[PDB]
Amino acid sequence: IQISGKGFMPISIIEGDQHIKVIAWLPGVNKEDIILNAVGDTLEIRAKRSPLMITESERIIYSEIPEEEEIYRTIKLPATVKEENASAKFENGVLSVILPKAESSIKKGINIE
Amino acid sequence: IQISGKGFMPISIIEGDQHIKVIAWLPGVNKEDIILNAVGDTLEIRAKRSPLMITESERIIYSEIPEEEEIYRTIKLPATVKEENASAKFENGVLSVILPKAESSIKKGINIE
Amino acid sequence: IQISGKGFMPISIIEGDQHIKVIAWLPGVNKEDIILNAVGDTLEIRAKRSPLMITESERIIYSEIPEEEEIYRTIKLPATVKEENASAKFENGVLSVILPKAESSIKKGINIE
Amino acid sequence: IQISGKGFMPISIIEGDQHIKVIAWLPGVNKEDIILNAVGDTLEIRAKRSPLMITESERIIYSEIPEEEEIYRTIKLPATVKEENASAKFENGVLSVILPKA
Amino acid sequence: IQISGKGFMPISIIEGDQHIKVIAWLPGVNKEDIILNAVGDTLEIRAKRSPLMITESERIIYSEIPEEEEIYRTIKLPATVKEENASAKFENGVLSVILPKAESSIKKGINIE
Amino acid sequence: IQISGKGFMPISIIEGDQHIKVIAWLPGVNKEDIILNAVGDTLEIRAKRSPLMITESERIIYSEIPEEEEIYRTIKLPATVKEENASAKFENGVLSVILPKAESSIKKGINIE
């Protein structure tokens, strides 16, 4: 597999026998500012959060949180997933996207003596 | 100032003339599993998120997200704030706490004599 | 991608999400002296040039124009494309081919609002 | 002879006993977007290839072809030619020009 | 080829003219705790050994045997095999897998002229 | 291309427009001790030469020739070859095998506008 993008964005890939549950923390991002796309065995994520606005009377004295907004990731899945039958959920800034496996190896397996 | 605690939890301190706005990303943490306590000129927040549950049929293959649950911080504010008149907002795993500065903490402008 | 072609290659690869396009210059080559072959995600091109000759009566000052009696290209496309839906156009010594993406690279991603 | 201009435009000057046939590959340029001028013993070829414009949905991922539009040359012929009795041919982006010697 | 998994599990790949015999040591593993899944030109083994049970009076003073239970591998076969017509044997903690080669994988003989 | 094997066995690949004549010095190898097998776009030849026997009165004092007998080379040709129409020649310890290219001989044709 290969990951590509820009911006701090940890992701967790949970493979299954019928899907590949993927988790990714996206705090501060609205529900609509997420353009999610996918096809075959590759995932295309798009996201963006508004900048840290401050009033003229306010002032930033110490902040370790990044500031860049445009952030995305492009993962190349090993097998194909049914994008048409896929779903996703975004709660508490946590994007949980399900990728049902497509014409995957049936992995029927072999009988062992 | 001095920050102390455990885990991963970036925080941004936005000082103001009448209040101290603070931002902290708490993704995957339930709104109820957040203990907000403070008094005088010190802040302490304790948060915890449920473990990444996976079905027995599932299996993790690649996850960069940390796993430790119990995480908190202990910020030592420079001046005094009005905790009784404070507020907090937890949206998209983004805790926005407002700490109005105390009346005695504001710069007593005696002007020229 | 990887491309080896002995003939001069002033070539382009114009990726279109609805359908991929490709533009290269073969001035002086006839429409019949071109063999277009494509399948899956690979392109095979075979053309000619007929190198210039100098008459004994003529006193050719020089010949800056370079050409190979037999030119060729072998491009490995990144994604699949419909060989049957491909459309070749050879005008002004320029072969402008449009190889639609396999299934028009329509893709499919969740909205999550 | 002397060649002067801009861009990439190989030219082949085929001299003869009664004419000076010249060849020049001009792919992508239209037959009308070629201003051919000549007089005495000097040549001037002014051309321009349309830009590699793409639709808003399209995108360029790999193209070694140049991008400049306006291109021309200025060949100083050795002897005099009959510009009034000159002609040219533009087929397959190949501008085949003939100049009967004076 | 590439092998990937976790734990201790030596494997030996025995190529043949009509099959790809593979050997694998799974000591201490029951016959039922082995899900052997093969399709096309790949292999996977889902194994797990029970924990070393000890009586309350017993104590472990020296053991070089690993402790982790979850163990598996992912072998990438060079050619394709007929998994539907494949077999395997597991005797004395030795997994003997029989992988008949596919019709397209068999190499044709050439007589030396 | 990719060469793989064991021992010392220089090989020279002579590609052609209709075949890929290959040369390989196999001194001391009998004509019968040559296993020629190929299919698609790959070649494998297993050769072996008996050890230099010596009489009890003889003695080896200096020999830079290797000793291992089983030697072979598995080459992955860049294109497909018609193994059914292959030929081989072994003269002066030089195995010359002419393999007619299958893809090159078959060729392809598509309409262009």
Side-chain angles (χ1 to χ4, degrees), chain C residues 12-13 15 58-59 61 64, chain D residues 11 13 15 59 62-63:
Chain C
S12 311
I13 317 179
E15 183 182 0
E58 295 298 283
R59 293 182 183 174
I61 311 199
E64 198 178 302
Chain D
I11 300 174
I13 304 176
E15 183 177 0
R59 59 183 63 86
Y62 182 89
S63 178

Side-chain angles (χ1 to χ4, degrees), chain F residues 3-12 22-27 29 33-35 43-49 66 68-75 93 95:
Chain F
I3 290 68
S4 59
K6 60 186 295 302
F8 181 84
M9 185 182 297
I11 299 175
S12 300
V22 181
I23 303 301
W25 291 358
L26 302 176
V29 188
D33 301 330
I34 305 176
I35 305 301
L43 179 61
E44 183 178 359
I45 306 177
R46 300 186 300 177
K48 58 181 179 61
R49 57 180 61 86
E68 72 293 352
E69 179 175 0
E70 184 64 11
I71 55 178
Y72 61 92
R73 290 294 192 276
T74 303
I75 290 71
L95 181 61

Side-chain angles (χ1 to χ4, degrees), chain A residues 1 3 8-17 19-21 23-31 49 52-66 78 90-94, chain B residues 1 3 8 10-21 23-31 49 52-55 57-66 78 90-94 101:
Chain A
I1 49 74
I3 299 81
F8 181 84
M9 184 183 298
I11 300 175
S12 301
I13 304 176
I14 299 76
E15 183 177 0
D17 299 330
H19 58 70
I20 304 176
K21 185 176 181 179
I23 302 300
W25 290 358
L26 300 175
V29 182
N30 300 270
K31 185 178 181 62
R49 58 181 62 86
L52 179 62
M53 60 182 297
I54 56 177
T55 310
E56 285 68 5
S57 60
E58 299 178 2
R59 59 182 62 85
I60 304 178
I61 58 176
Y62 181 88
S63 177
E64 183 178 2
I65 303 176
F90 179 86
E91 296 75 5
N92 300 119
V94 187
Chain B
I1 39 63
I3 292 71
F8 181 84
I11 300 175
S12 301
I13 304 176
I14 294 74
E15 183 177 0
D17 300 330
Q18 300 295 351
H19 58 69
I20 304 176
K21 185 175 182 179
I23 300 299
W25 290 359
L26 301 175
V29 189
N30 300 270
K31 184 177 180 61
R49 57 180 61 85
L52 180 60
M53 61 182 297
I54 56 178
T55 310
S57 60
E58 299 178 4
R59 58 181 180 274
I60 305 178
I61 57 177
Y62 181 89
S63 178
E64 183 178 2
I65 303 176
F90 180 87
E91 296 75 5
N92 301 120
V94 180
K101 299 175 66 177

Side-chain angles (χ1 to χ4, degrees), chain A:
Chain A
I1 49 74
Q2 300 181 2
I3 299 81
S4 60
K6 59 186 295 302
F8 181 84
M9 184 183 298
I11 300 175
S12 301
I13 304 176
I14 299 76
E15 183 177 0
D17 299 330
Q18 299 296 350
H19 58 70
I20 304 176
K21 185 176 181 179
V22 187
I23 302 300
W25 290 358
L26 300 175
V29 182
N30 300 270
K31 185 178 181 62
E32 293 177 350
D33 301 331
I34 305 178
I35 304 301
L36 182 62
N37 299 328
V39 65
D41 60 330
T42 174
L43 180 60
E44 182 179 0
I45 304 175
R46 300 181 180 180
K48 58 182 179 62
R49 58 181 62 86
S50 299
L52 179 62
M53 60 182 297
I54 56 177
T55 310
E56 285 68 5
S57 60
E58 299 178 2
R59 59 182 62 85
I60 304 178
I61 58 176
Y62 181 88
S63 177
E64 183 178 2
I65 303 176
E67 293 177 350
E68 71 291 350
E69 179 175 0
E70 184 64 12
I71 56 179
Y72 59 91
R73 283 290 190 275
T74 302
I75 288 70
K76 181 179 180 180
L77 302 177
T80 304
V81 298
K82 299 186 294 184
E83 63 185 342
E84 73 290 358
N85 298 299
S87 60
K89 300 181 180 299
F90 179 86
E91 296 75 5
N92 300 119
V94 187
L95 180 61
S96 303
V97 176
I98 306 296
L99 303 178
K101 300 178 67 59
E103 191 178 300
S104 43
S105 295
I106 308 107
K107 275 318 214 193
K108 183 178 179 180
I110 270 69
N111 182 62
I112 321 173
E113 307 335 288

Side-chain angles (χ1 to χ4, degrees), chain E residues 6-63:
Chain E
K6 60 186 296 301
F8 182 84
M9 185 183 299
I11 299 172
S12 300
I13 304 176
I14 294 73
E15 183 178 1
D17 300 1
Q18 300 294 351
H19 58 69
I20 304 177
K21 186 175 183 179
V22 187
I23 301 300
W25 292 359
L26 301 175
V29 187
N30 299 270
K31 183 178 179 180
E32 293 177 350
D33 301 330
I34 305 177
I35 308 300
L36 180 60
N37 309 122
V39 175
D41 58 330
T42 173
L43 181 62
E44 183 178 0
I45 305 176
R46 302 293 299 182
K48 58 181 179 61
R49 60 178 61 87
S50 299
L52 181 61
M53 61 182 297
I54 56 178
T55 309
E56 285 68 6
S57 60
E58 300 177 5
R59 299 184 298 91
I60 304 177
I61 59 176
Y62 181 88
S63 180

Side-chain angles (χ1 to χ4, degrees), chain C residues 61-62, chain D residues 1-5 11 13 15 20 22 37-45 73-81 99:
Chain C
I61 311 199
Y62 60 93
Chain D
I1 45 69
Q2 299 182 1
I3 297 79
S4 60
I11 300 174
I13 304 176
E15 183 177 0
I20 305 177
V22 181
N37 302 330
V39 69
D41 59 330
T42 173
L43 181 61
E44 182 179 0
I45 304 176
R73 292 294 186 277
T74 303
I75 288 69
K76 181 179 179 180
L77 302 176
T80 303
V81 298
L99 300 175

Side-chain angles (χ1 to χ4, degrees), chain B residues 1-92:
Chain B
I1 39 63
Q2 298 182 0
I3 292 71
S4 60
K6 60 186 295 302
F8 181 84
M9 185 182 298
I11 300 175
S12 301
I13 304 176
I14 294 74
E15 183 177 0
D17 300 330
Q18 300 295 351
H19 58 69
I20 304 176
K21 185 175 182 179
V22 187
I23 300 299
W25 290 359
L26 301 175
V29 189
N30 300 270
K31 184 177 180 61
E32 293 177 350
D33 300 330
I34 305 176
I35 305 301
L36 180 61
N37 300 331
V39 68
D41 58 330
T42 173
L43 179 60
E44 182 179 0
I45 304 176
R46 301 185 301 179
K48 58 181 180 61
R49 57 180 61 85
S50 299
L52 180 60
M53 61 182 297
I54 56 178
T55 310
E56 285 68 6
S57 60
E58 299 178 4
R59 58 181 180 274
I60 305 178
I61 57 177
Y62 181 89
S63 178
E64 183 178 2
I65 303 176
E67 294 72 5
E68 72 293 349
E69 179 175 0
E70 184 64 12
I71 56 179
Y72 60 91
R73 293 294 190 276
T74 302
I75 289 70
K76 182 179 180 180
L77 304 176
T80 304
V81 301
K82 299 185 294 184
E83 76 298 348
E84 69 287 1
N85 298 300
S87 60
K89 300 181 181 299
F90 180 87
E91 296 75 5
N92 301 120

